[PDB]
Design a protein around this ligand. Structure first.
Ligand SMILES: N#CCc1ccc(OC[C@@H](O)Cn2cnc3ccc(Cl)cc3c2=O)cc1
Ligand SMILES: N#CCc1ccc(OC[C@@H](O)Cn2cnc3ccc(Cl)cc3c2=O)cc1
Lengths: 203, 203
């Protein structure tokens, strides 16, 4: 009985080639979604008995778990096309700390260095859809995975601000936190390669 | 009079296409090398009057400076080919926290989350050459830029441990910390693109 956690920032499609692989080796496989901001909070609860977590969030050592890199995914800073900072200049990008940010909140109330909001003017939400609702309505700017803002960008309903900061979008590591048991377990190594293979393709 | 800081982790070659560009626009251009672990410590000293810093080190806001991404470079965990952990398994990689690490030290004595040593058994050095001296002699393992360990790897004098953690080597962002003045300054934007172009090629 394997239990896998995937945060909202992982493409849902990524699951496709992965869950096939696990199911070839494991007979029961449970899949769980959390906010990127709740992933690590969740695996630390011992009763949660999570075996593997795929998440963008980073911490330097979780008691029962080793860490490794599955690959990279792109996220963008986005606002209402006629947001003040729409011109996307370097002065614009510096000033994100002053303008209202739509951030993912956390059960634990606390945030990693990676996921903490950057502005004093913050408005917390439980998922990216809620976030992008308020960003379309010009309530604030937010940062969200490619696969969320892909549609709304071509539709002209949202504008990118991030390009002069990180051209091509903000590259962000997809980490795999795994219960120590699964080191020297050919099942997990089998998963690890196909998972990497899969996430290279989505690039 | 421009003053640019490049840490040891930046390929020396990167300077080539860059310093040409700056010199087309700026008439005096001073180039300074520090340890990655001293880069940000240095620019914070006000008398240091650094205008631009190219460094792998990360912090969330430095008073007088904005941040952006120039691109990505690869670093590897390396040891003596017959180091205990030479087999490079996931149990090996987890155990790096127990075996002696050769780390870059810092004037400020303190380290960023990114650059802090991961093991209790640490031996500090001022540069990568000193580091790789002691790692060849099996004194410990260390992590160093590609361009340092490139030679010693083909020569069989050093072995990679990092592959099952991050296949292809540990991708690490090259950041550009720049004095706020240089936002809305076509000279700097001119530098910013060629710098990105240059560092894409070195990939
Ligand atoms: N232009 C610009 C640069 C810029 C980048 C990040 C900025 O802050 C966002 C922070 O609130 C927390 N953060 C950071 N990196 C993430 C990566 C991926 C994903 Cl999916 C979510 C996040 C995320 O929430 C601000 C400015
Ligand atoms: N196998 C394995 C995974 C692993 C990665 C880093 C590990 O820790 C190194 C730390 O001491 C501080 N660090 C982190 N990332 C760096 C990136 C580039 C460069 Cl050039 C230097 C550094 C660096 O010194 C340990 C294990």
């Amino acid at each position: 009985n394997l239990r896998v956690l995937l945060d909202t920032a992982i493409p849902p499609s990524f699951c496709d080639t992965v869950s096939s692989v696990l199911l070839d080796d494991f007979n029961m496989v449970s899949l769980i979604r959390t906010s990127p901001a709740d992933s690590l909070a969740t695996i630390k609860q011992d009763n949660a008995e999570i075996d593997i977590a795929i998440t963008i969030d980073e911490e330097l050592k979780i008691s029962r778990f080793n860490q490794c890199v599955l690959g990279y995914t792109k996220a963008f800073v986005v606002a209402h096309p006629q947001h003040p900072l729409c011109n996307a200049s370097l002065h614009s990008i510096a000033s994100l700390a002053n303008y209202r940010q739509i951030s993912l909140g956390s059960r634990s109330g606390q945030h990693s260095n990676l996921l903490r909001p950057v502005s004093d003017k913050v408005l917390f939400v439980e998922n990216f859809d809620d976030m992008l609702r308020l960003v379309e309505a010009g309530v604030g700017w937010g940062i969200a995975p490619h696969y969320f803002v892909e549609e709304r960008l071509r539709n002209g309903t949202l504008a990118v601000l991030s390009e002069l900061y990180e051209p091509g979008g903000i590259d962000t590591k997809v980490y795999c936190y795994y219960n120590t048991a699964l080191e020297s377990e050919r099942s997990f190594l089998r998963f690890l390669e196909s998972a990497r293979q899969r996430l290279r393709e989505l690039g």
